[PDB]
Write a protein that binds this ligand. Sequence first.
Ligand code: S30
Length: 815
Amino acid sequence: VKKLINSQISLLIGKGLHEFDSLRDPEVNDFRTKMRQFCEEAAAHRQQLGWVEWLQYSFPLQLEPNRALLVNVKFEGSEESFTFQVSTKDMPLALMACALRKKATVFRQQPEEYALQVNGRHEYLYGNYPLCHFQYICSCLHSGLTPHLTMVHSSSILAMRDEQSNLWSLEQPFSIELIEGRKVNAMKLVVQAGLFHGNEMLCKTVSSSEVNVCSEPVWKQRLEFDISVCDLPRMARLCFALYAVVDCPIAWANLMLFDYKDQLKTGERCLYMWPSVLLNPAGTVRGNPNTESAAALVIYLPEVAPVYFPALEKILELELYEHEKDLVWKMRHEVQEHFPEALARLLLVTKWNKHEDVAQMLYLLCSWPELPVLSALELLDFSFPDCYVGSFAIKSLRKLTDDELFQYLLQLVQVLKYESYLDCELTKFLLGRALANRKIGHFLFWHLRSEMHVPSVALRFGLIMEAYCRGSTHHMKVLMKQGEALSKLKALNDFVKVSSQKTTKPQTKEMMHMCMRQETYMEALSHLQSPLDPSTLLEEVCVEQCTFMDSKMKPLWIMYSSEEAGSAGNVGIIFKNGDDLRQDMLTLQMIQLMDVLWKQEGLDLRMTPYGCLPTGDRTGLIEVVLHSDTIANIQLNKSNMAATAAFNKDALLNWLKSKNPGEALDRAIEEFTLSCAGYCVATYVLGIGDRHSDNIMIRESGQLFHIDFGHFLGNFRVPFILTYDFVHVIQQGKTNNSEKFERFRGYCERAYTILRRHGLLFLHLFALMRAAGLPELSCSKDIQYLKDSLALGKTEEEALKHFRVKFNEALRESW
Ligand SMILES: Cc1ccccc1-n1c(Cn2nc(C#CCO)c3c(N)ncnc32)nc2cccc(C)c2c1=O
């Protein structure tokens, strides 16, 4: 049976476990077995959680950042249901009290023994919270809909839990022998080596001598570095570049001078090199897995005697101008005593190529108080390679709530790429958090699963997903069920592209359905948790309603229903294969983040944060927003329709009218204006260009939102943007309506200002994303786009002035 589990894992993680053994690699082995131990202890913990604690683990609450309402409630056993009137202000327990008072009266006759499930969802209502704090209850009020809940008894919840069971002495200047290579070019070759700690070099980059273009080159020479061997910090990173010239890059390669046992490396080494777009400190520190084809650099770390980096207790024993640096360093204790939040800045002035200073720094670091989360996110930047700093940052990060953790999960995952060794605090942290919360577990998995086609991370990511699994057998099954669905989706989509290239849409659509109607597909595509959101159940796929966009990548449109979930189980997923969804996902997360920040100062711009989730190689899902359509479509202004207008500019408004009769119209225009402001500021701050009426959509509520991102931070300076046809809708259909127009400027103005206040949060976040290799996010010039857009260097009186110019500027540009 342990064989079954094993093969399921390899199947799930897209890498077979045998590959881990084949490497006969102590680091991997250690990682594997420690991390297995760790996770199995988590899982053990879990299997004995109390039932309310299990609910917390498995269906964590979904909260928002007096008045009446109809709620429909019923119990698990029977179909009989009651529709109560309760306040929006009542705790779930009041509602439960009612249910039971009604059950008792009908059924002829203990609220604390219950949780309320949202029907047809993995979602629950419990805790000491008024109902309109629950996103679902909240969502329902906004759309008019009657919450539909089931009284689920403690014995039943427990029944679920049960089913889910499983030194200083060495002062000579550091040096290497470059022996030779085995590679491909056109011209002479050179090797450049430099020793890095983070971005900053520990001295100059002693190159090679020029040698002929050749294929199996030989060097046999000492390169000696301008730094004492007893200096080298724990995280010293030796970096090579191989190029050709009469400048033209071929390959690059990095390694730690110390290994994971804190032993300085000796002697020889063959470095399987990575292809080029000269020096790449950021790049991974483990070799190219394609050993057949890769250029190989053989080098010689010499035996300076074994040599270990000193224990902590031995250590404990022992932008700004030149002088300013000197002063911080001097005032470092006082910096610790009175400004504990300036650590980053002090850390960037400590002399990392002088061991004594790194001792003095560390000793302060070791007594340093914990920092706020925002500061910790900054310390995770690659500028802080030291693991004592890493350890510090994780320790400060422990106070992250699950919602926040979820919020920055994509970034923390990306930062694993910076990591120097497989076993590290960040891995332990995330795994601990993922094992403690099934939603984090879900998304960690997919963040990882989705990058397995990527050589430099395949091993690392593979090993974590393995760990996770050892820690959650049941969740593993739930995830294979997702994997099988995505596998069928890929097959289905390939059929679609081949076929559509030979036949009319109607025909391929017919063909797609037959394919889908195969037992093997109905089985695969049904009865699963959405990878976009584990608390959304994809029950039966509605073949009749599925189709595909007959352009470009031919993405698929997959609809699903649920009897038990009714309306709210009528949900859809888009499956796209062929494009990178990373850019899209990132963009959508940042907007979602804007929305959370705005709501936290009580400003709700009625945003539409739909899931977008990469799952594999140029493959992921996008969550369908129903009841929506593009501006472009609407603006096609077709005859024999409700919106049929005398003037094109009326199209969009007629559409809204037709979707929103009588008194409803006002609120629609209101939703439109609110979301409009939101999206306007978000695209503007983010530098999202090439908006046009094809990539904007409105929902029937009037809510406006954006699709197909792929160009941000100004990677065409993006002006703020006002479309006349929106300005026309904001104005209630009037040529001049400056009451309504200026309320709009107001909203834009509030949302702009709130974002500036968390400017640092975006910066630190994007800082972390640089780890991802997204081509529109490659260097400073990009993070600078954000500084400029949030005019972060200015005062709030100023920036607002600045913004006002831009906004008026956009107004002129509107017709
Ligand atoms: C539904 C629709 C109306 C107007 C114009 C285009 C669409 N649309 C869209 C427009 N669209 N784009 C979306 C997106 C995205 C990420 O950039 C999207 C969404 N999340 N929810 C609803 N609609 C969305 N996407 C499709 C994807 C696959 C298959 C199909 C048939 C479509 C599709 O028809």
